[PDB]
Paper text:
Influenza polymerase replicates, via a complementary RNA intermediate (cRNA), and transcribes the eight viral RNA ([name]) genome segments. One promising target is the heterotrimeric viral RNA-dependent RNA polymerase (with subunits PA, [name] and [name]), due to its central role in viral replication which occurs in the infected cell nucleus. The polymerase binds to the highly conserved, near complementary, 5΄ and 3΄ ends of the genomic RNA (thus pseudo-circularizing it) and this constitutes the promoter where transcription and replication initiates. The polymerase performs transcription by a unique process known as cap-snatching.
In previous structures of [name] polymerase with bound promoter the 3΄ extremity (nt 1–6) was not observed in the internal active site cavity but was either not visible, due to disorder (FluB1 crystal form) or bound on the polymerase surface (FluB2 crystal form). A trigonal crystal form, similar to form FluB1 but grown at lower pH, yielded a structure at 3.8 Å resolution, which, for the first time, clearly shows the 3΄ extremity in the active site. However the electron density for 3΄ nucleotides 1–6 is weaker than that for nucleotides 7–18 indicating partial occupancy. This could be due either to 3΄ RNA degradation or a mixture of conformations between the disordered surface configuration (previously observed in form FluB1) or entering the active site. Of the capped primer, only the first few nucleotides (m7GpppAAU) are visible in the electron density bound to the [name] cap-binding and mid-domains but the expected extension of the primer to base-pair with the 3΄ extremity of the template in the active does not occur in this crystal form. Apart from this, the FluB polymerase structure is essentially identical to that previously described for form B1 (8), notably the base-paired configuration of the distal part of the promoter and the hook conformation of the 5΄ end. Remarkably, only small side-chain movements (e.g. [name] Arg40, Lys43; [name] Met227 and the Motif B loop 409–410) allow the 3΄ end to thread through the narrow template entry tunnel. Although the detailed interactions of the template with the entry tunnel cannot be elucidated with certainty at the current resolution, the electron density suggests that highly conserved residues from the anti-parallel β-strands at the base of the fingertips loop and from the N-terminus of [name] are involved.
Author numbering:
A (entry chain C): 0 to 485, 496 to 740
B (entry chain B): 0 to 645, 650 to 749
C (entry chain A): 238 to 723
The structure:
Amino acid sequence: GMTLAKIELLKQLLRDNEAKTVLKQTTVDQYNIIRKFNTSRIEKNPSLRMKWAMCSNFPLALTKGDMANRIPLEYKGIQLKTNAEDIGTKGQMCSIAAVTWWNTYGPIGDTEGFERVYESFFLRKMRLDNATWGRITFGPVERVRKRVLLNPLTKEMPPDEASNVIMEILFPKEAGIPRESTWIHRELIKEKREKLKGTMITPIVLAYMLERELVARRRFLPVAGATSAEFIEMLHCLQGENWRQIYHPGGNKLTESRSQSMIVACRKIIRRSIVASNPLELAVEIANKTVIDTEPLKSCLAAIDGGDVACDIIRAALGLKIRQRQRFGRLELKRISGRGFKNDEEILIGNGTIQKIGIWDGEEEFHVRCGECRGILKKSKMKLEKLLINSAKKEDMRDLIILCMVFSQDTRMFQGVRGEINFLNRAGQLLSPMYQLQRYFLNRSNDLFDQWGYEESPKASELHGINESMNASDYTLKGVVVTRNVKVSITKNLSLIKRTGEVIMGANDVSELESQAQLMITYDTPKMWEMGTTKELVQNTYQWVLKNLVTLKAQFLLGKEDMFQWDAFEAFESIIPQKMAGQYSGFARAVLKQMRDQEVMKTDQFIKLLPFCFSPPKLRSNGEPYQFLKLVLKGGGENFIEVRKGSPLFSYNPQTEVLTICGRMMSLKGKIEDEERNRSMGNAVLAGFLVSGKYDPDLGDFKTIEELEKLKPGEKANILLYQGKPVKVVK
Amino acid sequence: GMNINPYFLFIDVPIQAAISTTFPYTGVPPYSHGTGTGYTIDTVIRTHEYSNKGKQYISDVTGCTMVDPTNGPLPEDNEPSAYAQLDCVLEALDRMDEEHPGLFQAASQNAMETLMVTTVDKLTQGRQTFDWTVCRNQPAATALNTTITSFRLNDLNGADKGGLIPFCQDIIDSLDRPEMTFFSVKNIKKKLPAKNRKGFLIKRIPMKVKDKITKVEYIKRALSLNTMTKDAERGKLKRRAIATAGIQIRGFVLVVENLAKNICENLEQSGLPVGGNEKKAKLSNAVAKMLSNCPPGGISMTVTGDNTKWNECLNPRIFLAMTERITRDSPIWFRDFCSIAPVLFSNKIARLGKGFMITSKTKRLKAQIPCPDLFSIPLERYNEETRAKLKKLKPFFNEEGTASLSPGMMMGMFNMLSTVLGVAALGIKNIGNKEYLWDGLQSSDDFALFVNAKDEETCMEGINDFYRTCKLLGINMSKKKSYCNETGMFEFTSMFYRDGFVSNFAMELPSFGVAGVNESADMAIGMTIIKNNMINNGMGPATAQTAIQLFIADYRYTYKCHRGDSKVEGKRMKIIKELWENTKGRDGLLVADGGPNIYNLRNLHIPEIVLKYNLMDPEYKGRLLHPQNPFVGHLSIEGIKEADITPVKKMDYDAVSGTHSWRTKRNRSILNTDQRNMILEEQCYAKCCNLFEACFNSASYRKPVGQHSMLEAMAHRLRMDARLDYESGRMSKDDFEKAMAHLGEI
Amino acid sequence: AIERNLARMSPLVSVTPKKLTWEDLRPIGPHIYNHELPEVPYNAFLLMSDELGLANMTEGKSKKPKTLAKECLEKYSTLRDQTDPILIMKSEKANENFLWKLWRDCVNTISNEEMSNELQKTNYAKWATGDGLTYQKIMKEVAIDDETMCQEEPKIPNKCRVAAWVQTEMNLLSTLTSKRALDLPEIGPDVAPVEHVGSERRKYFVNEINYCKASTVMMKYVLFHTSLLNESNASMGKYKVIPITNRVVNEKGESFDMLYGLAVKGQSHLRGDTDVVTVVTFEFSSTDPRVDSGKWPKYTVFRIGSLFVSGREKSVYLYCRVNGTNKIQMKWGMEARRCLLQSMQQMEAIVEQESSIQGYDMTKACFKGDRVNSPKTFSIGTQEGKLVKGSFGKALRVIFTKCLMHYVFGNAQLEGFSAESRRLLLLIQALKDRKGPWVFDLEGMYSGIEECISNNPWVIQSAYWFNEWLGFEKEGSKVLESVDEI
RNA sequence: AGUAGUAACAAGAG
RNA sequence: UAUACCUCUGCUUCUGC
RNA sequence: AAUC
């Protein structure tokens, strides 16, 4: 036992008066102040100082111990260390040769336990060695900035919880007051104490290695397709702004992680296939050859008893049963009867703020579940009607009631959101309203039960009631009861119909949140880009237009409406908001035909609008099409094309004859008409409108689209093309 | 002939695309030489030049010359105005409170609830701090400990309670103490016996002596800011002065900065404290909104903006008035707590560097004229540049050798709260219901205003209205440096937007060099900086694979550790060549031990020790990863994971702790100097703390808590350790009775 | 209250904005074209274009820095044993005898059989290193009393005009050779497909630079500054002779140990980082210093033999100079290989961007030009007031040269210039993009740019190169884009 | 001398 | 002065938010 | 199908 030596060293220490005064005057708080006391200033230029110091004889300091003494003073003429002591360490200063001498001829220590101590790192090597790689592919990639886990953890905990667990593993006597966490991770502590038993390595090191494999490292990174930590660690080799790399990590993968991916895979198959005709036939084509990391979407949907609306529609579309389940984080549901419809309304909450939430309308019946506890839920628009739950643990019963209360979107629930905790991220991006309401009321539940209200318990033979404390009681929660008793076909347009005639799932019901997937979202067929994002699709289309411009510009002056529709443009239309798709396609087809029929042709404008002409056009009551300044696309305020100017996604430099498409430079030189040199752009800016002369001050100010559309054919007007270029145009 | 021009690339590639080539970061940064007295005095003159038309008065507390520009006459010129009008600042805040409701009182709560939990040790992480006891910039950990021990002599034990709040109460009360006593160490010669022919030896034992100063002298020392020059600051021709404040003010700045930080997080038009990929997103999303928000058939212009004399114009009395309005709902003690730091800065006194070295080229002699002796010599002796400066310093100069800098914010320190005042300018949006609309972004001196309007002639009238607003806040826009254009591309804090924030590899480029921690850490850091730049700084696989070669190149020369097979001569290389010939598993050797570089794009995230572990020889890994080896010795939770990179942000890495994770010698210059006395003072604490850690093994990981005595804790710990070891059987009757006898004496 | 003050405030206070137009952009630096000023002198630490390496073919493996410089001189003994000083050029404040005696003292010391490379503290070496030239510290009370002691006026950088040698340095350093200098070590094997693309990209990117002049100078600078720092810490009190070494490999694959001169490091008791250690250089050269006299006022040049460059003979010279470095600048020498990355990244961005557009690896296309696509071309420079189209490989190296010149002439003048010239570069890019740029105080913006141009060569030449490029971008944009949609 | 460039180093201290 | 052709020192009187 |  060390005990005697510690006390007899304390006797040595207390003999010195200056040391004795320190121990008596310093508090246990103040330890942290006196530990950091030294002469050492902070090194401002460490790269310099190290490069300098390495050229000196004896730059390294050493620890005063028996092992330090086992290093000799010289070896084969080379001085390893000097008798001169270091100020801080009180040990013989040495050269970098001593390090090499130790490693070459020193004592051979105990390496038993090392692999288990530094486990966390060896699994990163395990995830590279066992892994396999796929194809490199060059082409544009949108990369979105989002907070993600940098390294995969053994068991995630808060900073205090992980620390308290660590304390129990390494320093049990000094742990102090036990918490709930003491009990919760008892298996992990028992495992880690048995694993880290035989090792000789210092506690402070061991506690650092636990902290890495318990405490979470979450920071913002640019990502695209893969969000999972086992991918995030490899991110640098997965994707660059202009390339893609397929990667498959080793070991094992999580079941939940496979669903989060699986949803977005379906969600995009549906989001693509809607605009192209025979939506089932395109969705089947893709879905038969989609891949999640290694597993195909067919096998994932078969094995996983989860998914959403989109997953069910594809599950049907391919074949086999459809699990109508909704996972609200902890809660896991299943639909008995009723069919809801989402609606966005401005809902005032308890603290005094109004935030947009997608409210569910109509009456419904669900089969709830929360760990061990079970039940059956009934609700109407913003009201919980019934909750017939079974008896289980207090925490499982309490949280299931909180999950069901939020879910129901009750007006009583929204009034008790007091304590300013809103849903808007630090980086200017809105969090999901409903999920943030769950996390608030799970911890702060006193408002929820108080603002709900109570009533009489059920007086049946099998039915009873429970109060706020989760015990059998007379005054139960208003609409809560504790009882003792525990094929389809698919359309062309992707709606699931019952044998009778009613439609259980609709294509219009799938959620429009095109979020980041968890695992590698691969498409084994060609033309993968068709399931991408706005800037990925926008570019790849315009790249394909310029690729075939020799054919497409010729065939636009021979066949009238043969090449207005093309296999590439179907995908382009899917990122146009379909409430406007026809209106843009009316304008596009009208302005392009104005350059065909008349002599005033513009190749830059042709290439810009040629992708907009797939959709069947939708004109006004007059006959004339809809006129536009910008053609707005799906998601992000920056995403649009401009008619009368250059846009963030599409602009032209006519000096160099070079086109900028989402950043990428594209040479249009040697692919232009010579008569475009001084040809005005007003003759391809409004449909059925051409330039007479230049701005006439008698005509007045520059007239707007609404004003221009409401002019008689043969009326002159003032149009500003791009800033500082006035033009005088007639209908 | 043919004249090659590098600027001719800008025909083929636009400026923003190849902006990396406009940054000369392979080159050497500018450093200062000699004193920074003239640099400081120039700041002192300039600061008072912008306020001299305000209210000049004499402080009855200190006896100093004070100037006050706040609520002063408005400027009739484009020179830097410090004359900020309180009402306009309050109205700007009121608007911000309307646009962001319930924020001020919530943030005031957040910071107040933090304050209670914040310990005294929090002051130890302030780098070099001015120690008022010895008048030197010392380490924050020491500068605190000197201040705690000196307070104890004047009956001030607030630090003993453990909370910051009583220590801050002791600081405001220490001004009231008439004579402030403190320690100063002096040497006594003592005979100690020896085998020294004459059987003894003289040893200069240090001893601490009690030393007093007056109330006013202590007030001035408490209000002192020590000034240097700014070394290694990029992209500037002439050098500038900086400052370091004392331990007293440090406590009160933390809370006022935390308060403003809480506000700056929630504000939509700020790049602080948000950084890295978070700020890259926040600005990118906030651009898209403020772009597409503009009227159709109108104009949206982005003013690429920047302020001038940012620190010199902003008065402390504005910052005082800011806190009061932010804490309006919070209690009277916290309102008074927050009001101190701006009250100190309002009455601050600036120390004047080293002095002025005077010479005679004929005689070949030199001599530093120190700050107090600046006027102990005819002004004709100084050069024309310095002669003008000293004449202008006269009314503000203090006879002790300082200058009272009542206006301005030397150093700055208040970043967040000064950024909030910027955001408050951006929050106005319009004046007189005219046909323009502005909103922007902010990071202290750097702003980026957008203006949406009908035509461009209107836009410029709105930017004038923005300019004339910011004058009333004390925020002076740089007419020279700032410039405007149509929205689409701009610059902000060296981040270049051109329909998207472009990659600028030259900014990070210096960080690719060898770090200067140790062989094990620098390897891990080196491969980490590669990995990271590939992701978010746009390094392709070829350049990344080159950087792997270029790091190892510099590593092998810096640490003198070339491949064992290579015949490059060296002291270490001689043993490295023997290691190569001895060891069988030579691919398992680390580069530091002249091993081969196994690194590549895919495995940059893994530590070299972990990669090669399987291919090492048992004897090699046994020595390399020996548990009781002397090289590492004693670690700390901050030391293993984290390391500095250049405020200086401390990044983290991963590497195994083995023989190459060593430490270097202390700077031995301290041996020659009179500060020898601190060397023993350290080793006295180190002896106590290392013994404390033997009793409490969790003291390394967890910060121990306790207002009780440090000895008391150790005694009780050792008491049970004995008793339980006896009863268990680990200790005998012989040893237990010895142990119980010793603990009785203590 | 804001509006209340805004009303009563004086109209004199305003931004006073003006729309920027191409004619408002006057040429930067009037003085640099003025012929009354002296031409900017060559003031680099070592030689670059003018250097001459004494090639000793070796085994390839490393040896002592004395032993290689010895055997390098053994091969070219004619120059080694040339004792007669045939002086050509002199630096105003130089000592012909001391300098030559120093060179002879070096040559013999490298030639000798002893292990040490130490040079004796002679009467000449003490002049050439500056022994005892530091001033004496005295008591403040004495200096206060002594009426002769005064604060001296500060030394300011002089104003130089444009010099052609910088242009020619750029022209020459950019150009290819048959020799490779770089010491690029091994890496791990390529398993992933991105690593194979990265490897095949390096075979074009790295070996384009490696085979140029600028690559050899860069490597020479580094390897000198690596040993120069090493001697400076270890051998503080000792005056030591260090050779200017580089190992070079040709197209055949044969290691030629080079020697571009010899140098002598002074006494190096370097406390602060900025403390100077004076280093005396002696450098071989084919260039006649009487060609460009204004290039070499800092140098003192002898003539020491002759060498046949191929058939016709070239006279060999010895460029001597008292120079100096410091701990910071020596370190930055060791981190000067990073000049590769800053230029290689920039052009890998083009390869990556062009690979996205075409959908395959557009490396081999950009340099050589494959079946589908022609080679990528860049505006490289001028030919009697006209444009010139250089290839990818050339455009890569012109950027790489600039990154080396950012080091070689890296200082307060370059940093302050580059930053302020950027502001004007961005304003030009607005006029190029037709984004209607406005400015508030252009004269004062110019003032910040123009004050940084004094006596730094790369600053002075880049002020000219700016004004040349400006002239081309002014006539391109103001003609074509002025009248189009009218 | 030279390095440097608004002021230093070209050794300091006992 | 003397020891001192010795001895000690190379970011440790300045380098912040 | 998001939080920390």
